Amino acid sequence: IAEELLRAGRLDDALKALQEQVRSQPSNATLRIFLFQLLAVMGQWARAQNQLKVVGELDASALPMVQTYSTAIDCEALRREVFAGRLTPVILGQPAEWIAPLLQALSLDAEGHGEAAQALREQAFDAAPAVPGRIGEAPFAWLADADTRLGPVLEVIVNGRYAWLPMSNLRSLKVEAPSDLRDLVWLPAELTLANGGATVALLPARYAETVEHGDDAARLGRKTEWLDSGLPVGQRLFVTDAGETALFDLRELDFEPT
Amino acid sequence: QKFIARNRAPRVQIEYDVELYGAE
């Protein structure tokens, strides 16, 4: 029943139903695995973390998941602060000069200087290099996030820490369709850096304002849209000179060497 | 025009059936 409520996108109803299941069978680790993931989709971070702890205690084999995703949930809170201009994200790989105006634009927006913020983003975008490549076999001349606050930057969680990765620091990305409910929130990815490094990563898969300002469908990544405020909610979307690809549909992305 | 989405209309997406009970 909770399963079917989830499928219908009825999150509140699904949660109510699932909590009653857990209450009925409180030592069933699998119900608590469902519950943690559902709470994550709903953005109830502390409660999702609570369930992970209990999962860890019931099923010790689940402990590496518990470690990975409890620190992923901590990172999801840094996101709100980052996009509110209150927290500086670290940058992985070679420093990119044009990140600085992007970050300053976030803090100028927060102070109500939207014109000055737009001026800095325009300068950042001008400076950021168009790098050609391929999505699968389909070529592009440039690629960026549809979120103008990011442009050609990828949000990542790597080794337990939130970061921005300039796309010009990226050589390739490989991702599969989402498989588990938690994958709607954090899509697993294999990254290869322009500098040679390779790392597994988690990609925050929804825009940060989705939890507070989206609907259930946006929280489930079943749509992407822009609010009257101009901010996007729902599933991450990449745009190119030639088309667009939503993150859940991306499989292989490659950039041509500079 | 680089890096700019030309359209900000809502996007309908492919929906994925996902697993609910697995931790590996």
Side-chain angles (χ1 to χ4, degrees), chain A residues 3 7 30 34 37 125-126 128-129 142 179-182 223-224 226 230 240 244 246 248-249 251, chain B residues 2-23:
Chain A
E3 296 171 358
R7 182 175 273 102
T30 72
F34 178 13
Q37 293 187 102
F125 278 37
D126 270 311
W142 52 255
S179 184
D180 294 292
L181 183 58
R182 58 194 176 270
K223 64 170 168 182
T224 306
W226 278 262
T240 70
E244 65 193 43
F248 295 165
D249 308 343
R251 299 290 172 261
Chain B
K2 78 178 157 156
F3 304 141
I4 295 304
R6 299 171 311 271
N7 160 31
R8 294 178 143 208
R11 313 300 215 267
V12 302
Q13 305 287 10
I14 300 172
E15 303 184 12
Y16 293 91
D17 178 52
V18 294
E19 303 247 17
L20 308 178
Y21 304 113

Side-chain angles (χ1 to χ4, degrees), chain A residues 173-246:
Chain A
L173 160 161
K174 175 167 157 26
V175 305
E176 297 165 26
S179 184
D180 294 292
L181 183 58
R182 58 194 176 270
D183 294 345
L184 304 178
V185 180
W186 309 280
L187 191 65
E190 299 180 326
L191 309 178
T192 297
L193 292 183
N195 70 26
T199 189
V200 301
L202 293 168
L203 311 176
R206 325 171 284 191
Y207 294 108
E209 292 65 27
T210 308
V211 161
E212 181 181 2
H213 303 288
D215 55 18
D216 287 352
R219 273 184 289 283
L220 291 160
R222 296 180 181 177
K223 64 170 168 182
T224 306
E225 69 179 325
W226 278 262
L227 306 169
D228 293 336
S229 71
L231 295 185
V233 291
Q235 190 191 157
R236 191 171 303 286
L237 182 65
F238 303 99
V239 287
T240 70
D241 60 298
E244 65 193 43
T245 302

Side-chain angles (χ1 to χ4, degrees), chain A residues 3-14:
Chain A
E3 296 171 358
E4 288 307 290
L5 288 164
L6 172 71
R7 182 175 273 102
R10 292 164 49 182
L11 302 178
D12 287 346
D13 289 344

Side-chain angles (χ1 to χ4, degrees), chain A residues 21-43:
Chain A
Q21 284 189 270
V22 164
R23 191 219 71 191
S24 283
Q25 295 171 65
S27 66
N28 190 330
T30 72
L31 304 175
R32 291 189 186 267
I33 289 169
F34 178 13
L35 184 52
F36 130 69
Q37 293 187 102
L38 181 62
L39 289 164
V41 169
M42 301 176 76

Side-chain angles (χ1 to χ4, degrees), chain A residues 84-225:
Chain A
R86 288 195 295 267
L87 193 76
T88 305
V90 303
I91 308 300
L92 289 183
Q94 173 177 37
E97 222 175 63
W98 48 267
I99 292 286
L102 281 180
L103 293 180
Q104 289 173 31
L106 290 167
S107 59
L108 283 180
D109 274 331
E111 298 173 41
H113 300 284
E115 303 299 309
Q118 171 64 21
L120 287 170
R121 290 191 179 107
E122 287 173 8
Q123 299 165 9
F125 278 37
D126 270 311
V131 185
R134 276 184 292 107
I135 299 178
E137 310 306 330
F140 56 80
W142 52 255
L143 183 147
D145 199 295
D147 182 3
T148 54
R149 294 168 308 179
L150 283 178
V153 175
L154 188 72
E155 302 184 62
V156 303
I157 295 161
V158 172
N159 289 312
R161 171 182 62 184
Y162 178 80
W164 284 14
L165 176 67
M167 289 181 179
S168 60
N169 286 349
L170 194 60
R171 171 67 54 242
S172 72
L173 160 161
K174 175 167 157 26
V175 305
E176 297 165 26
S179 184
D180 294 292
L181 183 58
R182 58 194 176 270
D183 294 345
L184 304 178
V185 180
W186 309 280
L187 191 65
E190 299 180 326
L191 309 178
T192 297
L193 292 183
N195 70 26
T199 189
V200 301
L202 293 168
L203 311 176
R206 325 171 284 191
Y207 294 108
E209 292 65 27
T210 308
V211 161
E212 181 181 2
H213 303 288
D215 55 18
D216 287 352
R219 273 184 289 283
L220 291 160
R222 296 180 181 177
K223 64 170 168 182
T224 306
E225 69 179 325

